Structures are given as structure tokens and as C-alpha cells.
């Protein structure tokens, strides 16, 4: 055993989907995401994991608000309207 016959017994998931990152790294019994650290308030990341930081850092999503912050700054955070 310990090879092919043992691989036949693999039908119980150690991890499921994480609510925070969606990676299937949420350890069911530990109730902790091995990837993002949920439910810890901080997002898990390590300076030895530079590639993982790059995978999950700012700019890898769509930046729904941060993408417009810069244009708003350039216009000086104006508040009125263009006023034809």
C-alpha cells in the first residue's frame, strides 16, 4: 500500500473555498484559510513569499475605486459640475 491503493481513499476535502480569497485554501477543521489567513483581520503575506505577494497585491484586481483616485487627485478633488 501507501501508493496507488492508498490514493483510492482520497475523498475527504481538507480545504474548501475561502470566503475572502476564493482559493479553496480554507482549512475546514482549522477554519482558517492557508492562503489569505481568513478569518484573521490581516491578509496573510510573507516577505519570503515575494511571488505570492505579487500574485495577490494591489493591481491584480480591478481596483474599483483606487483606479479613479488618481484622476480625482489630478483634478484636485473637485466637487461641483462641469457647468457648460
Amino acid at each position: 500500500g501507501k501508493g496507488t491503493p492508498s490514493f483510492g481513499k482520497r475523498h475527504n476535502k481538507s480545504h474548501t473555498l475561502c470566503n475572502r480569497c476564493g482559493r479553496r485554501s480554507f482549512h475546514v477543521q482549522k477554519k482558517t484559510c492557508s492562503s489569505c489567513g481568513y478569518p484573521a483581520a490581516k491578509t496573510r503575506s510573507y516577505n519570503w513569499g515575494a511571488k505570492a505577494k505579487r500574485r495577490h497585491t494591489t493591481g491584480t484586481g480591478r481596483m474599483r475605486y483606487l483606479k479613479h483616485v488618481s484622476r480625482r487627485f489630478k483634478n484636485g478633488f473637485q466637487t461641483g459640475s462641469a457647468s457648460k
Binding site: K13, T16, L17, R24
Partner: protein
């Protein structure tokens, strides 16, 4: 499992909706580097891993 969580069923629904070949009118667009659906998945080849 036939008794699945709604989250699982939602993921399977998305996978089913995106299990299709490339639309044929793409490959007619002006520049169109796209040749085929390179992200096609099949239940017999690559598992979704949830």
C-alpha cells in the same frame, strides 16, 4: 454529491455556462489574435478542484 452547497452549485453553473467553444464571429474581428478557447475545461480531463 447530489446534496451540494449553493456555493458549489453556483460554481458549477458558471463552469457550465463557460463550457463552450469560441464564438465564430470572433475570428472575424479586425485584428483578432484569438484562435480558439484556450481556457476550455472538460470533466474528463481537468478537475475544477471545487
Amino acid at each position: 454529491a447530489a446534496q451540494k452547497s449553493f456555493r458549489i452549485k453556483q460554481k458549477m453553473a458558471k463552469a457550465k455556462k463557460q463550457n463552450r467553444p469560441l464564438p465564430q464571429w470572433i475570428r472575424l474581428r479586425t485584428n483578432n489574435t484569438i484562435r480558439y478557447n484556450a481556457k476550455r475545461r472538460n470533466w474528463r480531463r481537468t478537475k475544477m478542484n471545487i
